Amino acid sequence: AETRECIYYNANWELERTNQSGLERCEGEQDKRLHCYASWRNSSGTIELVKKGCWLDDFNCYDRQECVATEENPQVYFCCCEGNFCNERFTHLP
Amino acid sequence: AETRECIYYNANWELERTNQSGLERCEGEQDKRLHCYASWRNSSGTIELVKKGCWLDDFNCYDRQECVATEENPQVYFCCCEGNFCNERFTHLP
Amino acid sequence: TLPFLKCYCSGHCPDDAINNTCITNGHCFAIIEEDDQGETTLASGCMKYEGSDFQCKDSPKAQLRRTIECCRTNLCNQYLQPTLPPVVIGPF
Amino acid sequence: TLPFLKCYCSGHCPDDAINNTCITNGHCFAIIEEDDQGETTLASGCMKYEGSDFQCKDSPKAQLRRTIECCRTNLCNQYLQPTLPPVVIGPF
Amino acid sequence: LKSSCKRHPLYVDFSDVGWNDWIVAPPGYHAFYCHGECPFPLADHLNSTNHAIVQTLVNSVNSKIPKACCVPTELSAISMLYLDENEKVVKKDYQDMVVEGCGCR
Amino acid sequence: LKSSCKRHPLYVDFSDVGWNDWIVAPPGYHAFYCHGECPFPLADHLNSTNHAIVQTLVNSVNSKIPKACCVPTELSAISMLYLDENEKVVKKDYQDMVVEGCGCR
């Protein structure tokens, strides 16, 4: 089968009672791709990391080695990719 | 909940690899009645016991303390009832 | 994840409803809606947790005029009475 | 209780059918049937174990004329070709 | 509404269908069936899935997409005594024979 | 037959339904839906129950009794990132969102 590892992060690790950072081993069904994702906010210049982790088979993440937020100017940024720790770094380009 | 016990018998205990006689504790779902049954053949006078055991909630067995085969002249006789070991004895009356 | 919330139901009551009340693990709801022939009705009941966010949000594009509102405290929908979305007139 | 039987399929083939062959835990079948407009067709495929006794027995009272036959050995239905039930004429 | 998804009556009589030659008991049974519309919103007792809920919403917007369907979501078993091909008597508790609850899927 | 029970296409676009204000990702997804007739006999891949098989037989004899219905019998999940009422970001793997297989029930 196919395995996967991603960078894990949770800005709200308090209430959710989880770690603030770490790694995550993804688990997917038969012949289903596995991805990683990242999401953040851009408080005018300064970037607030919101969450990072595993993401299930999604057409929008296929064959993407890098995590890139494509939405022009969203309230919450997001990017996903197909590769171990591919969410370790991310960028924003409309 | 409600419990139940019946007389168990299996004419074909060989191939099925089970006991030829014994007892059986019935298992039923919530608020569902539990019954016992008996089935036999009547080789013109001589009676061949075929099977006895538990039987699930069945309108045709409701409130019957005795096991009675009502079918006029069937190839295989059958009767069911609602009571512990109620199938220990059976009769035939069209 | 277990049935803990109690709601009032009307027109959407399950069969085992006790005194127009249903139990759920999700949300209570009330809905006002106008049918294909211009009649408006108010109904209410219980909504299971799975899919409640989709149903409580509803869609502005629904073909029939309606407003559904949800709440998550015991019998919170007994006095919940939503109003229909306004009808847009024009260009005339 | 596991998928061990192989059958030939035609008109009832699953999507993952390999060379007009389906796999099942139940029975293979072949059926000849006359539709509402008098057309007769022969089809075949796999039938899951649960409910196979009901389906293989069929009902004489079926509204459409048809004959289905089952068998439980690998590709046993490749040459299985049932014939339709006779049409009863009269009282004339 | 009388037209909404719910259980309806259905008694299956083995003598009528013609299965009395192989089924010894029972003579028949109440199977019931599910039928009725699945309109918005789907209440708790309709035991729907996320998918059926979403399809119901889509249908509300675009009628070309069909509504969810009313089907059994909880079934119960009944005991039957029958004769196999070898004219041998078998007792089996057939599962999923009776509709206990209907829902939208 | 083109009319038999099978999976059909259905893409749910969040912008169109209006849920893009609370759903951050994905922009939408292929949900599919099941539709089609469930005639006799029910093949293995239609994953039917004893009840649906019996109802199909009854309908064959008495058309007043409806046919079994084509519904999802296997569903899969998708990940979504959304904002709760508190404008807080939540990641959840929603179960039973995508139709993988259709059957008669």
Residue numbers in the entry:
A (entry chain C), B (entry chain C): 6 to 99
C (entry chain B), D (entry chain B): 32 to 123
E (entry chain A), F (entry chain A): 10 to 114
What did the original publication write about this model?
Bone morphogenetic proteins (BMPs) and other members of the transforming growth factor-β (TGF-β) superfamily, like the activins, growth and differentiation factors (GDFs) and TGF-βs are secreted signaling proteins that regulate the development, maintenance and regeneration of tissues and organs. Members of the TGF-β superfamily bind two different types of serine/threonine-kinase receptors termed type I and type II receptors. In the present study we analyze the interaction of BMP-2 with its type I receptor BMPR-IA and its type II receptor ActR-IIB. ActR-II and ActR-IIB bind activin A (Act-A) with high affinity in the low nanomolar range leading to activation of the SMAD-2/-3 pathway, whereas binding of BMP-2 occurs with low-affinity in the micromolar range resulting in the activation of the SMAD-1/-5/-8 pathway.
Analysis of this complex yielded a hexameric ligand-receptor arrangement with all receptor binding epitopes occupied as expected for the dimeric BMP-2. The BMP-2 double variant L100K/N102D binds to ActR-IIB with an affinity (KD ~ 140 nM) almost as high as for the interaction of Act-A with ActR-IIB (KD ~ 60 nM). Confirming this, our structure of the ternary complex (1:2:2) comprising BMP-2L100K/N102D shows no additional intermolecular H-bond between the lysine side chain and Cys59 of ActR-IIB. In the structures of the Act-A:ActR-IIBECD and the ternary complex (1:2:2) of BMP-2L100K/N102D the Lys and Asp residues form a stable intramolecular salt bridge. Accordingly, Lys100 and Asp102 (in BMP-2L100K/N102D) exhibit low temperature factors indicating that both residues are quite immobile. The "rigid lid" centered above the conserved H-bond between BMP-2 Ser88 Oγ and ActR-IIB Leu61 amide might provide an effective shielding from solvent access thereby enhancing the strength of this particular H-bond.
